[PDB]
Coordinates of all heavy atoms in Angstrom, one line a residue:
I171 N 0.8 -1.2 0.0 CA 0.0 0.0 0.0 C 0.9 1.2 0.0 O 2.0 1.3 0.6 CB -1.0 0.0 1.2 CG1 -0.2 0.0 2.5 CG2 -2.0 -1.2 1.1 CD1 -1.1 0.1 3.8
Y172 N 0.5 2.3 -0.8 CA 1.2 3.5 -0.8 C 0.4 4.5 0.1 O -0.9 4.7 -0.3 CB 1.4 4.0 -2.2 CG 1.8 5.4 -2.4 CD1 3.2 5.8 -2.4 CD2 0.8 6.4 -2.6 CE1 3.5 7.1 -2.6 CE2 1.2 7.8 -2.8 CZ 2.5 8.1 -2.8 OH 2.8 9.4 -2.9
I173 N 1.0 5.1 1.1 CA 0.3 5.9 1.9 C 1.0 7.4 1.7 O 2.2 7.5 1.8 CB 0.5 5.5 3.4 CG1 0.1 4.1 3.5 CG2 -0.4 6.4 4.3 CD1 0.7 3.3 4.7
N174 N 0.1 8.3 1.4 CA 0.6 9.6 1.5 C -0.4 10.5 2.3 O -1.1 9.9 3.0 CB 0.8 10.3 0.0 CG -0.5 10.4 -0.7 OD1 -1.5 9.8 -0.5 ND2 -0.5 11.4 -1.7
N175 N -0.2 11.8 2.3 CA -0.8 12.7 3.3 C -0.4 12.4 4.8 O -1.1 12.5 5.7 CB -2.3 12.7 3.2 CG -3.0 13.9 3.9 OD1 -2.7 15.0 3.6 ND2 -3.8 13.6 4.9
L176 N 0.9 12.0 4.9 CA 1.5 11.8 6.2 C 2.0 13.1 6.8 O 2.6 13.8 6.0 CB 2.5 10.7 6.2 CG 2.0 9.4 5.8 CD1 3.2 8.4 5.7 CD2 0.9 8.9 6.7
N177 N 1.8 13.3 8.0 CA 2.5 14.3 8.9 C 4.0 14.4 8.6 O 4.6 13.4 9.2 CB 2.1 14.2 10.3 CG 2.5 15.3 11.2 OD1 3.4 16.1 10.8 ND2 1.7 15.5 12.3
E178 N 4.5 15.4 8.0 CA 5.9 15.4 7.6 C 6.9 15.7 8.8 O 8.1 15.6 8.6 CB 6.1 16.3 6.5 CG 5.5 16.0 5.2 CD 5.6 17.1 4.1 OE1 6.4 18.0 4.3 OE2 4.8 17.0 3.1
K179 N 6.3 16.2 9.9 CA 7.2 16.6 11.0 C 7.7 15.3 11.8 O 8.6 15.4 12.5 CB 6.5 17.6 12.0 CG 6.1 18.9 11.3
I180 N 7.0 14.2 11.6 CA 7.3 13.0 12.3 C 8.6 12.3 11.8 O 8.7 12.1 10.6 CB 6.1 11.9 12.2 CG1 4.8 12.6 12.6 CG2 6.4 10.6 13.0 CD1 4.7 13.2 14.0
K181 N 9.4 11.9 12.7 CA 10.8 11.5 12.4 C 10.7 10.1 11.7 O 9.9 9.3 12.0 CB 11.6 11.4 13.6 CG 11.7 12.6 14.4 CD 13.0 12.8 15.2 CE 13.0 12.4 16.6 NZ 12.2 13.4 17.4
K182 N 11.7 9.9 10.8 CA 11.7 8.6 10.0 C 11.6 7.4 11.0 O 10.8 6.5 10.7 CB 12.9 8.5 9.2 CG 13.2 7.2 8.4 CD 14.4 7.3 7.6 CE 15.5 6.4 8.1 NZ 16.8 6.5 7.4
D183 N 12.4 7.4 12.0 CA 12.4 6.2 12.9 C 11.0 6.0 13.5 O 10.4 4.9 13.5 CB 13.5 6.3 13.9 CG 14.8 5.9 13.4 OD1 15.1 5.9 12.2 OD2 15.7 5.6 14.2
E184 N 10.5 7.1 14.1 CA 9.1 6.9 14.8 C 8.1 6.6 13.8 O 7.1 5.8 14.1 CB 8.9 8.2 15.6 CG 7.6 8.1 16.4 CD 7.2 9.3 17.1 OE1 7.8 10.4 16.8 OE2 6.2 9.3 17.8
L185 N 8.1 7.2 12.6 CA 7.1 7.0 11.6 C 7.1 5.6 11.1 O 6.1 4.9 11.2 CB 7.3 8.0 10.4 CG 6.4 7.9 9.3 CD1 5.0 7.6 9.9 CD2 6.4 9.2 8.5
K186 N 8.2 5.1 10.7 CA 8.3 3.6 10.3 C 7.9 2.7 11.4 O 7.0 1.8 11.0 CB 9.8 3.4 10.1 CG 10.1 2.0 9.4 CD 11.4 2.1 8.7 CE 11.9 0.6 8.3 NZ 13.3 0.6 7.7
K187 N 8.0 2.9 12.7 CA 7.6 2.1 13.6 C 6.1 2.2 13.9 O 5.4 1.2 14.2 CB 8.4 2.1 14.9 CG 9.8 1.9 14.7 CD 10.7 2.0 16.0 CE 12.2 1.8 15.7 NZ 12.8 2.8 14.8
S188 N 5.6 3.4 13.9 CA 4.1 3.7 14.1 C 3.4 3.0 13.0 O 2.4 2.3 13.3 CB 3.9 5.2 14.1 OG 4.2 5.8 15.4
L189 N 3.8 3.2 11.8 CA 3.2 2.5 10.7 C 3.2 1.0 10.8 O 2.3 0.3 10.5 CB 3.8 2.9 9.3 CG 3.6 4.4 9.0 CD1 4.5 4.7 7.7 CD2 2.1 4.6 8.7
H190 N 4.4 0.5 11.3 CA 4.5 -0.9 11.4 C 3.6 -1.4 12.5 O 3.0 -2.5 12.3 CB 6.0 -1.3 11.8 CG 6.2 -2.7 11.9 ND1 5.9 -3.4 13.2 CD2 6.6 -3.6 11.1 CE1 6.1 -4.7 13.0 NE2 6.6 -4.9 11.8
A191 N 3.4 -0.7 13.6 CA 2.7 -1.2 14.7 C 1.2 -1.2 14.5 O 0.4 -2.1 14.9 CB 3.0 -0.5 16.0
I192 N 0.8 -0.2 13.7 CA -0.6 -0.1 13.3 C -1.0 -1.1 12.3 O -2.0 -1.8 12.4 CB -0.9 1.4 12.9 CG1 -1.2 2.2 14.2 CG2 -2.1 1.4 11.9 CD1 -1.2 3.7 13.9
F193 N -0.3 -1.1 11.2 CA -0.7 -2.0 10.1 C -0.4 -3.5 10.3 O -1.1 -4.3 9.7 CB 0.0 -1.5 8.8 CG -0.7 -0.3 8.3 CD1 -0.1 1.0 8.3 CD2 -1.9 -0.4 7.7 CE1 -0.6 2.1 7.8 CE2 -2.5 0.7 7.1 CZ -1.9 1.9 7.2
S194 N 0.5 -3.8 11.3 CA 0.6 -5.2 11.6 C -0.6 -5.9 12.1 O -0.6 -7.1 12.2 CB 1.8 -5.3 12.6 OG 3.0 -4.9 12.0
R195 N -1.6 -5.0 12.4 CA -2.9 -5.6 12.8 C -3.5 -6.3 11.7 O -4.3 -7.2 11.9 CB -3.8 -4.5 13.4 CG -5.1 -5.0 13.8 CD -5.0 -5.2 15.3 NE -5.4 -4.0 16.0 CZ -5.1 -3.8 17.3 NH1 -4.3 -4.6 18.1 NH2 -5.5 -2.7 17.8
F196 N -3.3 -5.9 10.4 CA -3.9 -6.4 9.2 C -3.2 -7.5 8.5 O -3.7 -8.0 7.5 CB -4.3 -5.2 8.3 CG -5.1 -4.2 8.9 CD1 -4.5 -3.0 9.4 CD2 -6.5 -4.4 9.1 CE1 -5.3 -2.1 10.0 CE2 -7.2 -3.4 9.7 CZ -6.7 -2.3 10.2
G197 N -1.9 -7.9 9.0 CA -1.3 -8.9 8.4 C 0.2 -8.8 8.7 O 0.7 -7.8 9.2
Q198 N 0.9 -9.9 8.4 CA 2.4 -9.9 8.4 C 2.9 -8.9 7.5 O 2.4 -8.7 6.4 CB 2.9 -11.3 8.1 CG 4.4 -11.5 7.9 CD 5.2 -11.2 9.2 OE1 4.6 -11.3 10.3 NE2 6.4 -11.1 9.0
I199 N 4.0 -8.1 7.9 CA 4.6 -7.1 7.1 C 6.0 -7.5 6.7 O 6.8 -7.8 7.7 CB 4.5 -5.7 7.9 CG1 3.1 -5.2 7.9 CG2 5.5 -4.7 7.2 CD1 2.8 -4.0 8.9
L200 N 6.4 -7.3 5.5 CA 7.7 -7.7 5.0 C 8.7 -6.5 5.1 O 9.9 -6.8 5.5 CB 7.7 -8.1 3.5 CG 6.7 -9.3 3.3 CD1 6.8 -9.7 1.8 CD2 7.1 -10.5 4.2
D201 N 8.2 -5.4 4.9 CA 9.1 -4.2 5.1 C 8.2 -2.9 5.1 O 7.0 -3.0 4.6 CB 10.2 -4.1 4.1 CG 11.3 -3.2 4.6 OD1 11.6 -3.0 5.8 OD2 12.1 -2.6 3.8
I202 N 8.8 -1.8 5.4 CA 8.2 -0.5 5.3 C 9.3 0.5 4.8 O 10.3 0.6 5.5 CB 7.6 0.1 6.6 CG1 6.5 -0.9 7.1 CG2 7.1 1.4 6.4 CD1 5.8 -0.5 8.3
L203 N 9.1 1.1 3.7 CA 10.0 2.1 3.2 C 9.5 3.4 3.5 O 8.3 3.7 3.2 CB 10.3 1.9 1.7 CG 11.2 0.8 1.3 CD1 10.6 -0.5 1.5 CD2 11.6 1.1 -0.1
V204 N 10.4 4.3 4.0 CA 10.0 5.6 4.5 C 11.2 6.5 4.3 O 12.3 6.1 4.5 CB 9.6 5.6 6.0 CG1 9.5 7.0 6.5 CG2 8.2 5.0 6.2
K205 N 11.0 7.7 3.9 CA 12.0 8.6 3.5 C 11.5 10.0 3.7 O 10.3 10.3 3.3 CB 12.6 8.5 2.0 CG 13.6 9.5 1.7
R206 N 12.2 11.0 4.2 CA 11.9 12.3 4.4 C 12.5 13.2 3.3 O 12.5 14.5 3.4 CB 12.1 12.9 5.7 CG 11.6 12.0 6.9 CD 11.6 12.7 8.1 NE 12.3 13.9 8.1 CZ 12.5 14.8 9.1 NH1 11.7 14.5 10.2 NH2 13.2 15.9 9.1
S207 N 13.0 12.6 2.2 CA 13.5 13.4 1.1 C 12.3 14.2 0.5 O 11.2 14.1 0.8 CB 14.2 12.6 0.0 OG 13.1 11.7 -0.6

């Protein structure tokens, strides 16, 4: 899934893990790519 409209002030590390913890409810997750470029 491609998620946009994310709060850009949130740090890469915290964002990656927040996304991971929330979406892990819906299935096993292989990776999450996140960049603030």
Side-chain angles (χ1 to χ4, degrees), residues 171-178 180-204 206-207:
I171 59 175
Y172 166 87
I173 309 159
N174 68 333
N175 195 61
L176 299 174
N177 190 335
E178 295 174 17
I180 307 304
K181 309 213 259 287
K182 177 177 109 191
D183 278 19
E184 185 188 4
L185 179 39
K186 190 156 166 184
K187 301 177 181 65
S188 284
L189 295 170
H190 179 281
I192 273 163
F193 283 107
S194 292
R195 187 92 95 195
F196 301 100
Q198 171 69 13
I199 289 167
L200 302 180
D201 200 26
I202 299 181
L203 281 73
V204 167
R206 314 192 342 175
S207 66

